[PDB]
Amino acid sequence: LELRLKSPVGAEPAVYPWPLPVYDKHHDAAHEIIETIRWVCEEIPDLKLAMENYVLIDYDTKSFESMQRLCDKYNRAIDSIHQLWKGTTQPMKLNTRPSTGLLRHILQQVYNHSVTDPEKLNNYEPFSPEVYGETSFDLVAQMIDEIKMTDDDLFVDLGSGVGQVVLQVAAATNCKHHYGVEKADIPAKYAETMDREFRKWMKWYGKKHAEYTLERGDFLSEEWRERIANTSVIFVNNFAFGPEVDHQLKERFANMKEGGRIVSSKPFAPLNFRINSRNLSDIGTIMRVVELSPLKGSVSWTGKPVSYYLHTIDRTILENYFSSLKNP
Ligand SMILES: C[S@@+](CC[C@H](N)C(=O)[O-])C[C@H]1O[C@@H](n2cnc3c(N)ncnc32)[C@H](O)[C@@H]1O
Numbered sequence: 001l002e003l004r005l006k007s008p009v010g011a012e013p014a015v016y017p018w019p020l021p022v023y024d025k026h027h028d029a030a031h032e033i034i035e036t037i038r039w040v041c042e043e044i045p046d047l048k049l050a051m052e053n054y055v056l057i058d059y060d061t062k063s064f065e066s067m068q069r070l071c072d073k074y075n076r077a078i079d080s081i082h083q084l085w086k087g088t089t090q091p092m093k094l095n096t097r098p099s100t101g102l103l104r105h106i107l108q109q110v111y112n113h114s115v116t117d118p119e120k121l122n123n124y125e126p127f128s129p130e131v132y133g134e135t136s137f138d139l140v141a142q143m144i145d146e147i148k149m150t151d152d153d154l155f156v157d158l159g160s161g162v163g164q165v166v167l168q169v170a171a172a173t174n175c176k177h178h179y180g181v182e183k184a185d186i187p188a189k190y191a192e193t194m195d196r197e198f199r200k201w202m203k204w205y206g207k208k209h210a211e212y213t214l215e216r217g218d219f220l221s222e223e224w225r226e227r228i229a230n231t232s233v234i235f236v237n238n239f240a241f242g243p244e245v246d247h248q249l250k251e252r253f254a255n256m257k258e259g260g261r262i263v264s265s266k267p268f269a270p271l272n273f274r275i276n277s278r279n280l281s282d283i284g285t286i287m288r289v290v291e292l293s294p295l296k297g298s299v300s301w302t303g304k305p306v307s308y309y310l311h312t313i314d315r316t317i318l319e320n321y322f323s324s325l326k327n328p
Contacts, residue, residue: 001064003071005033006078008040008047009094009206018064023112030061032109037074039102043205044092046084050077098207103171104137106201107164114193115162120186130184131240134161135265138295139308140168140235143263146292147310149173149233156228158236158249159183162190163214165235167198170212175233178212181219188216220248229255239265250283253313260313263292267309275321285321288312 003016014036020029041048055073059066085091098106115121124130149155153175157165160180170178182188191214202209219228228234229252238246250268253260262268269284271291279285289312294305 003033003064003067004075005036005071006075007204007206008044008078008081008092009204010082011200011204011206014204018067020061020067024118027108027112028061029112030067032112033067033071034059034061035105036109037070039105040074040078040205042099042102044081046089047077047081050080092206094206095208097209098171098202098205100141100172102205102207103168106171106198106205106207107137107168110167110194110197110201111162111164113197115190121162121190123186124184129159129241129245132161132184132187133237133239135165135235135237136306137164137168138298139306140165141172142292142295143235143308144169144172147233147261147263149175151176153232154230155179155233156181156231156235158219158228158234159238159241160191160214161187163194165237166212166214167194167209169235171202171207171209174210176211178210179227179231180212180214181217181224182215183218185216191216220245225252225255228252229257232257232260234260234262236262236264241266253311254283254286256313258313258315262287262311264309264311265307267291268311275317285318286313286315288314288317 001018003018003020005014007013016029016033020033022028037051041051051074055070059070061067121132124132151174155166155169155173155175155178157163157180160166160182163180163182166178166180169175180191182191195214198209217224234253236249238249241249246266246268253262253268267289269282269287269289271289273282273284273289275285290310292308292310294307298306300306
């Protein structure tokens with residue numbers, strides 16, 4: 001026994017066994033199905049136009065028949081749309097990026113099909129750099145909107161977890177490459193499935209994504225010293241990293257090129273940094289730091305609004321200090 005949803009672009013249908021599984025207290029396969037149909041409707045006007053017909057909510061996530069009736073109405077509409085494209089009508093553009101709303105849904109779907117046992121992610125040594133925590137879709141969305149990127153950029157998420165930040169960025173921008181490196185076995189293992197599921201579902205919806213790679217590794221290693229040096233945009237959720245690891249990261253950001261940028265949950269240099277005779281060796285001498293605007297309604301455990309910081313490699317700061325010394 002099952003449930004099938006045909007792809008709007010001919011990819012292999014999505015098959016859900018019955019009974020539909022539950023992902024967590026607020027997410028189950030039944031709702032995923034309904035939302036997926038809703039979103040494909042957003043991709044295809046004619047499809048949405050056909051789904052209005054009679055579907056007066058007469059479906060209940062409990063009954064197989066009731067769900068099978070929903071899927072079938074969706075599937076029959078997809079067949080007609082497919083015939084419609086054989087006619088004169090223009091077939092949906094295949095190399096487009098997903099809208100933000102579809103992307104949120106897609107990542108939710110990929111996650112649920114990938115992180116089967118969410119609890120396992122918390123099995124980490126507390127009070128260590130291994131502490132797990134996920135950056136909200138919204139913040140990543142904010143970063144993407146504020147930190148403009150181009151096909152010239154190289155994006156890296158240091159300590160990528162199951163890799164959902166990399167996936168969102170790869171789906172939203174056109175960097176030459178996106179990388180995620182994660183050290184712990186658990187999140188890294190899940191990342192392999194996140195990766196497969198993601199590519200599979202993007203194909204299913206007919207949406208394009210930039211190049212990306214999810215890697216198992218240690219970003220403090222020798223290999224990464226240079227890779228970091230060549231990265232133009234680094235995202236790093238270092239809230240629980242600690243002074244030791246942050247110090248080491250600073251030692252590595254010191255080799256980045258001008259205009260290179262770093263977005264993190266904990267600043268690598270004071271915001272009020274004033275270069276003087278005692279702090280010449282400080283990383284703050286070669287970078288501008290600013291606090292990104294907080295997203296309205298966003299309370300972290302600290303009770304205050306969640307905060308992220310943008311650092312921009314700017315050696316002009318240092319150059320001017322020395323000039324100021326040739327005077328005054
Ligand atoms: C807060 S989690 C990241 C969650 C995901 N990056 C996000 O933004 O939602 C931080 C990750 O850093 C990783 N990490 C810590 N030290 C690392 C190292 N030296 N090399 C690679 N990953 C490391 C951990 O294993 C942990 O999963």
